Amino acid sequence: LIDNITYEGDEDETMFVGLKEKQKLHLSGVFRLQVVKGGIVYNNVHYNASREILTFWHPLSQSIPTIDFSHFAGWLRVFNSNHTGLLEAGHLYRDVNYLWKPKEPYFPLNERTTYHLLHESDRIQSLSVPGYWSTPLEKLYLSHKNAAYDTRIMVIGGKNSGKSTFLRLLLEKFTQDIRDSTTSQEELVYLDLDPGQPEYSLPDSISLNKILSPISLGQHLCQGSNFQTLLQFYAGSSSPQDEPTSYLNCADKLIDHLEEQAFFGTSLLNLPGWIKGFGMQILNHIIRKYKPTHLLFLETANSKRHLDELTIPQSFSTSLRDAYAPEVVRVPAHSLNHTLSSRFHASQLRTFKILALFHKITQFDYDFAPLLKSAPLQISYGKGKSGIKGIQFPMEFQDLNPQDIKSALEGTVIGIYTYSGEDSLEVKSLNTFPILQSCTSSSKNFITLGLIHSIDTSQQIMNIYVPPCHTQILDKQPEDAQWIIVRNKTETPFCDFLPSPRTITWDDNIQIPFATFERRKKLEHVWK
Amino acid sequence: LIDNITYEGDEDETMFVGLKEKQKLHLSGVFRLQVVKGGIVYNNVHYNASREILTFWHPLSQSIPTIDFSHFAGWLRVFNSNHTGLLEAGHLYRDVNYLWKPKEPYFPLNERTTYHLLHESDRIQSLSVPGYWSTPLEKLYLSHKNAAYDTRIMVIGGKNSGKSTFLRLLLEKFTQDIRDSTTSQEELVYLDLDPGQPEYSLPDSISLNKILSSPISLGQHLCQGSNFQTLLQFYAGSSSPQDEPTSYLNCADKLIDHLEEQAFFGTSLLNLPGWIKGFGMQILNHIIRKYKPTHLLFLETANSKRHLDELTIPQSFSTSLRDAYAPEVVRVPAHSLNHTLSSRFHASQLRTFKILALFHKITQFDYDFAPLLKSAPLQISYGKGKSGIKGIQFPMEFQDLNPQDIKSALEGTVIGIYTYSGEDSLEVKSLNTFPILQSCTSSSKNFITLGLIHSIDTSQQIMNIYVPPCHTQILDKQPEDAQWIIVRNKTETPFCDFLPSPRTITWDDNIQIPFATFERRKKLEHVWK
Amino acid sequence: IPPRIVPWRDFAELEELKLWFYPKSKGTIEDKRQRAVQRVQSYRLKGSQYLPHVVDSTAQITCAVLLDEKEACLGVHQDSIPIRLSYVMALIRFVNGLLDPTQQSQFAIPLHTLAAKIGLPSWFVDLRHWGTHERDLPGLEMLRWAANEALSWLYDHYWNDEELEDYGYRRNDKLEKYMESLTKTLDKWKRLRNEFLEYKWVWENANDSLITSSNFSGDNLVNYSSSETMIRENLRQWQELWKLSIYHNVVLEKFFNNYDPLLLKVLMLNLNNFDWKVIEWVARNYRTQQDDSNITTILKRKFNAWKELQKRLLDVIINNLNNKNFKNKWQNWEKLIDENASYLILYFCQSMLAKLETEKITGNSWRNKKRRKQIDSTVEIEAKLKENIDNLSLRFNEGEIKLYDFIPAEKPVKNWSRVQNWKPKPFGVL
Amino acid sequence: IPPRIVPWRDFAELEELKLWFYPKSKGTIEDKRQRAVQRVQSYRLKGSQYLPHVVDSTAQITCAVLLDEKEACLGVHQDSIPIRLSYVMALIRFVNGLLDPTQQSQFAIPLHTLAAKIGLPSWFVDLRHWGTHERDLPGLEMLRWAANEALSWLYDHYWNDEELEDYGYRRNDKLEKYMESLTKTLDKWKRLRNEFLEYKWVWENANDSLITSSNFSGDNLVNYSSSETMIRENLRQWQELWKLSIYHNVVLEKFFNNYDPLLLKVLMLNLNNFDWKVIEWVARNYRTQQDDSNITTILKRKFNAWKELQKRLLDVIINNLNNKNFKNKWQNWEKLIDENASYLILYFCQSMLAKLETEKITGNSWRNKKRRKQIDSTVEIEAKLKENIDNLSLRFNEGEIKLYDFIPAEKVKNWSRVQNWKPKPFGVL
């Protein structure tokens, strides 16, 4: 298709496109559209434009859903992304240099653009919502208005399920419909109970978050800013398996909240997939708990064999007092249809979100300067205590040498916490560190992740980075309130942790600890 | 190709055959020959026809070699071994029924004949002697008379290598010389330290034992031969040394030292457990430097031999003795028998027969195979003193056994009677009337015979048990004063004795059987294996 | 259904074990699994082989879950790494244990498929290399959950489920094919009874005769008994039938059911070790009458009074015993004498002692010069007997002979001593 | 040779560990083995992505060895089922790690062939099943032999053997092309200086011109430039160069070498987050002169003296900054204000206090009504600057300026922002 005109400036390099008839547009990376005329039909959906903008997200790992021309009647656009630097981060991490854009597109590309046309030659997948997937989901937004009660929808699959795609499909549609209905208080809640591929949640964390305009789709890798987080919990790993017993407990605490607000309306969650394994064990208590008015199975010929017992076994008829309902369906697909990564590892990706947060000034602005350059706000742990009340550890490491503790904390991601309901501090003291005692500490508040640059023992101060975005939420709290730090096994980024020439040149004299540059002695290889 | 001379020979089924004929003789079982005239060619060996009876052991499991004729010059022959019992085991033991005689023979079976004749039609395979082996085994012969020093010969093989037959071939070859050399008093002592398929030693045990020059007994007797006398012995308690490495090396180390103390000069022989791949190179590598072997040997060839190479060379040393000042290296084809080794006789099935042959063995050549439960056990009393029994020894695991259930474990468990050489002190920890050697150790102890417990009486403190009959009166011989130790180790009391076949023994129908259940096993209780 | 060995004495014992392993209702003080594993630890001792895999694993696991339960000072070194280490090992075993035996095969169902067949949740089989292969060991909670879950499964499938699925003829056939040839030979004997007497010479001296004339006789000497050979063959079938020391006690049970005074003479002479088997069986039969009023032995059926027994059978054996044969086997006798003690034995020994003296008065043969070495044996035997005789005469008076007729017929401890009177027990209760 | 993260801090942490694992002393004070596993049970807190296998199972084994050797009515002797289990578990994890990593060595190898290369005892491969695929776990003694040999073997094989066998141009490459463009752009500006000086209205009212005539104006008119376009094109390259915040300090260094106060004025008007990016870099370079007495800063080199610095740059910046704009970004200045402290920031807050006390003077325009939500934020701000002037004026005095001038010229309150930071790599406090 011969290209529609493009006009530079004033800012954002906004580009306007005319496509003959109704045609599939291709976009990679950020952009915001305000379509004056015609009907937009991405994934066979309707989005009228009347001076109303909608931000788009187009990551590479997923398939990018092209944009259809729908009536009526057609034939600023191609608005650049609001965020200053999120694209910029590629330099700090350079396995992510092509998340937003391909290496050699058929375009002289530009720094200025936050979007990129991908015309066929590039070979990126564009695959549209499979009609097989359509009737199972088409049947759901019909249940939304006539349910006469808030409807709980549960989607479950193993990784490679394409489960993320399904809930995204539901969210944008449930999202469009809520706007149309007047007056609707039914703001659907997205309940992310999977650490492993977190959506809308801190990495290796669990977040219950409200999904309120303005319009954003489809995949943002957690930088979307279309959600508000009412409450969240720190799982501390990229698997429920490291702590399944705790996690259901952490999740169990979260769902009850919905009745704590006693909410009513649409809600959605994606369970940790657990298609074959302990997951058969994992799923059968929250199907028991979430009162799911709609389960969803996608395994098909995946195979779909592993999940046989659970659907009937955990059904216990209808758990909810009012809903009293059951549902059993299967849709079989693997998506994207092309290889699931599209040359993008989830564990390689999982590191981006960690890095991407620690440089988020605000939702629309990102700075990719290594965190080392930036000053890190200082927390002084108290015996007494002021600030930090205790440091909390996973169960296994409850016996530890006092001396090594300073070494262990430094340069490792930790999650900040607040005491909330009053309790005895109940912490043993080691080497001037108020270690948490007996673990426990059942009632607590999770505010943000924290990374520690340094600890000064004599001072009792603790040099800790937080993503300046939430600053000043930490500052906007009573100083008195006790703080607990939980050092779960969340991975610190290498590219950030010890930086580079070009990245930084440091000083010649200084010696960097925790780093050795001798080639490894044979047999020193890590078991992975 | 026609049978000959099946003379009735009254009682004893005595039989005759002719030296002259050009076809090799075959036979299966326990027989004994004196040739009238003409030389014999067994395993490429020569024995003259001049009126000395030679027994021939032909168990089925081993390959059976023909009997060869040679000059000069011919043309009581073949007559039954004097064993009432040995042949009769099958009725007691189903598995070993065909050990001496093939199940369908195409010869007319005779109940009263110890020895059967086999001719091609029958399955059994005669390896005889490999040509490849001979040059090493032959050349060993040239070094017995010649050396002028005691010659210590070691052979190491993986089980199924064929070490046990290479040794007897050496053993058979050497014995022939000892009879004919004047004056050669250097009777070889076999040094059988393999409890895996032990030959010449008590089940799950270890032995250095002298070999008698006459009268001849060949070739494999399943340890039932009258040709060896036990000088000293030790009980590992396990199928393999690995279960108790610490003792065996120690258990062996004490064995060789005995050789020095009696100050033997002359031939000695040993087969180690082969241990080809595994911990074995280190374990062997300990007593190679101790045994001071003149001629270490290997048989694996395409064993494959890969595992059994490097450790020994490090293990190998310049000398084990001042006069010796030498070492020798050799490798050999390792395959005998050519046909599949089990031959319907897995070693694991044969071993439990050896345990059986002892307990039911009345005398040197007389065996009674009635189920033990008819025979009445002799009784000695474990006691507070105790005088008969002061402590029972348990391996290091099993230390925490609660007292009450100690009695149940003992009954029906094979145990090894030990005598304490004079001891500084008794080391008894006792629970519920059984004195138990709490810290193990107790290096002093001696091995007389195994015993199998019939029952134990907590109140009287008496301990009924069976002992192999042949061993009495040796238990009788030991002074009353001498302390007695019951050692519990993992040896397998045979099933067949434990519950006799119903036909074999008649029990009142009512009487409860303590250790067995006849209910079908609910799924799924099975012995992992 | 041929019986299987199992370490526990009784089913009741097993019932005892199950309750220990899962305390009912409460576990607070009755946990009774510290003891439970103590026992199973013994069963392992009797044999590793005998114990079932499920039982072994139910103790191994409950071992490890008990290991973590230590909460007291002084504080232990333990890093919670061995315990993390222990929990897994039972599982790799316990789970490996169900699939492999009975038996893992060249043709076998893939592991996931097998887990389904038993009733194993296929979330186990993920377990089997789950610990070994992964770099780092799983956290305590994951293991804790699995044991407290698996243990319930063991209780769920084996402990609390009865599903049963998972000699007589061929071994009775050889015995059948013995008794018939026996009863064929005895029914060959009676027809010969007359012949044996006429030919006293053939049976009596068979051991005795060194040389045979026919061999000695020259070929073609000069121009010139199928009731003898017919005797010897019938006798051969008696020796051959006697090589089998297993059915010895059934050759007799048939002999005493057809007692011939003449036969005994024949048997003792031409059947090695026949002299001491009979008397041994006469005692076991005799005592048995004493112990139980009820079972009137073949002996009491053959003999209804002590006197009848003494003249007909008991006396007769003594007369025909070779002095040398009895000597040359004394060890068998002492055991025979040692093993079983009863008045009958006393009368035997005294009668045996007596005849030993009357063969000394008769002693003044031409061969007396030879005698001195062998004199040192006869005295010893006389010497042992006095010890045995004097022994019994303190336990058994002639008051017992009355306890054999009065039964109505049915129409210290010394070391390593033989146990004198024995009734076979299957390794239980003596 | 790219760096490796390692949980110990230095080779003097891992030399020390070697002694602990194999002390050669049986008992009491000399032995330091409980502790030795208690620190590899620490690295595991950071670990175990970084931690090598060869130091894990030498702390896994040795942990189980201290388990069975308990001699006070405790541990292995009273009951010994677990102890047997531990010995085997840490051993399978031992062989498997070297034994099964596979990825380190090419796939599909038979284990022994895999076994041959590393120097593994051959039996160890035989070792792996040990207790997994055999009915009874091996003898509590046989477990003992392997563990002691294994520590010995690992120590001989790994700890003391010296074998070491078992680039980043692009980062240099990316910067150089970029430098060529900052230098390419800067020179273009010098040429455009006359045009920039002349066409002043263009880059001053960037904020004002929301509406442009050109967009409104009619097309193909019957009735009916170089200078404006060039500046607009050049002021884009700056914008594009300023989007990459990583090279923010690179540009500032480059600009200062070529420093011109017109470019200052220019950039302070058309690049977002520039007004505070300079003073930070200035508060940086001003700071490092005081502390480090041997290093000549670009800023010091540019300005020898205080007043020269004060008039030329500090004084120039204050006038330029847009007061309405300044408020929006103020928490920036706050943290920066808190973030870096020096007499330079003393004079700054006093100055930028005065500039907000001359705007209220001329501030007396007609529109009182529409600003009643705009005074409080100015009240709070001025209050914030007064506190920070007094908190700084108790530490900093006129003497320092002499301190700056005399340099030779070469021709803990809860959640807080640390005031002065020198990039330190997760060490040195």
Author numbering:
A (entry chain B): 65 to 139, 165 to 301, 303 to 618
B (entry chain A): 65 to 139, 165 to 618
C (entry chain C): 2 to 167, 180 to 237, 248 to 434, 484 to 502
D (entry chain D): 2 to 167, 180 to 237, 248 to 434, 485 to 502
Can I see the authors' text?
A HEPN (higher eukaryote and prokaryote nucleotide binding) nuclease Las1 and a polynucleotide kinase Grc3 assemble into a tetramerase responsible for rRNA maturation. Las1 and Grc3 are highly conserved proteins and have recently been identified as core enzymes involved in processing and removing ITS2 spacer, which is a key step in the synthesis of 60S ribosomal subunit. Recent studies have demonstrated that Las1 is an endoribonuclease that contains a HEPN (higher eukaryote and prokaryote nucleotide binding) domain responsible for rRNA processing. Grc3 is a polynucleotide kinase responsible not only for Las1 nuclease activation, but also for nonspecific phosphorylation of the 5′-OH of the 26S pre-rRNA produced by Las1 cleavage, providing a signal for further processing by Rat1-Rai1 exonuclease.
To elucidate how Las1 and Grc3 cooperate to direct ITS2 cleavage and phosphorylation, we determined the cryo-EM and crystal structures of full-length ScLas1-Grc3 complex at 3.07 Å and 3.69 Å resolution, respectively. The ScLas1-Grc3 tetramer structure shows that two Grc3 GCT are stabilized by two HEPN domains of Las1. Each Grc3 GCT binds to a groove in each Las1 HEPN domain and extends to the ribonuclease active center, which is formed by the two HEPN domains via dimerization. Both the crystal and cryo-EM structures show that the conserved catalytic residues Arg129, His130, His134 with two copies from two HEPN domains form a symmetric catalytic active pocket. Specifically, the side chain of Trp617 within Grc3 GCT inserts into the active pocket and forms packing and hydrogen bond with catalytic residue His134. The side chains of Trp488, Trp494, and Phe499 of Las1 LCT are inserted into the three hydrophobic core regions of Grc3 CTD and form stable hydrophobic interactions with multiple hydrophobic residues of Grc3. Notably, compared with CjGrc3-bound CjLas1, ScGrc3-bound ScLas1 has a more compact catalytic pocket, which may explain why ScLas1 shows better ITS2 cleavage activity than CjLas1 in the presence of Grc3.
